Design a binder for these strands. Sequence first.
DNA 1: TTGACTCTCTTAAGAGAGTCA
DNA 2: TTGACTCTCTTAAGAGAGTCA
Lengths: 162, 162
Amino acid sequence: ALTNAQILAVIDSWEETVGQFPVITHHVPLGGGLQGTLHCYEIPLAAPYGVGFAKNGPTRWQYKRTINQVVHRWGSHTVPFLLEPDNINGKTCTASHLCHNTRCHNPLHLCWESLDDNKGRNWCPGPNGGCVHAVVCLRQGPLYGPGATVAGPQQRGSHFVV
Amino acid sequence: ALTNAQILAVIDSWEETVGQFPVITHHVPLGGGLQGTLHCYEIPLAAPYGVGFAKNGPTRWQYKRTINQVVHRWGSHTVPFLLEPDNINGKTCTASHLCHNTRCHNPLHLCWESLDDNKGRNWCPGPNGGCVHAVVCLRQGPLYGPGATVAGPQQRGSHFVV
DNA sequence: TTGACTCTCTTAAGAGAGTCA
DNA sequence: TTGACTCTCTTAAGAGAGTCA
Ligand SMILES: [Mg+2]
Ligand code: NA
Ligand SMILES: [Zn+2]
Ligand SMILES: [Zn+2]
Ligand SMILES: [Zn+2]
Ligand SMILES: [Zn+2]
């Protein structure tokens, strides 16, 4: 809600509740042939999820609190960033999973960045494979690799040059 | 429906028309601080676009040919790949711009791959910067770089470990 | 047969808001 | 007040199909 105190209280309640989610260890590729370990705090698969939480889509949740007798509601991963600018360079800021695990609500696995920056982490080589993200990746992106291209660039005639 | 020979004739007519589009020379980053040059064959901004071509969206076009009294229509960048498999790994193949120039129809700037592979090229460091795509990128992706993350991972208390 | 428009849809990273109990 | 559901929307890489002359 409006006041900084009220916002901090929302952030504190969220952290306390998410802090009680089951902690699931995930071993992950870091790039460079190295492996690391992340501890994700995973929202339950089905209700009840935790005080203040409700599922609005297959892998979407919202956090809600009653402040000043009014309901305030946010996307479940946006809460850590309520005191941050909500846009950058004219682009909406989004909660971005460094662990690539939607159910995870560990704020140490989230950043706040444009949707393009967010998406791009899916292909990052990772913190030991050449990640250049200024806010560093925690793991190699799940889609990094050579790809599975069916056909490359080609022409039948002689009308084109690279 | 259409025979192999008829499909080849469609590809040949498409190439002849696209070959007459304006050819625009672009200097592009290759990765590793190197610069290169791409020659894009750009569909016009407004009608007429070329024989067989029509705009179905702000940056979407289709190619249409009528064969033996039947109208056939394809996405304008899919024509080079009409003799290729249309899916891989259970994913639909899509036309992917190696030059990241949507108006470009140069078939030497296109490949045919899953939408995830396609998207991922936006963040590739490029053919001189570490590209690992088996069908190699022609340039560094436009979104490669440190990003513009507004806020990184953080917590107010001690409820979480990474 | 052709051109120039019209419309809605897919995907996977993300969102906001309403209906009931 | 809190919980458990429902619905549609955004973005930027991509699509198919209808109408009229
Ligand atoms: Mg993400
Ligand atoms: Na692309
Ligand atoms: Zn996590
Ligand atoms: Zn990274
Ligand atoms: Zn091009
Ligand atoms: Zn590449």
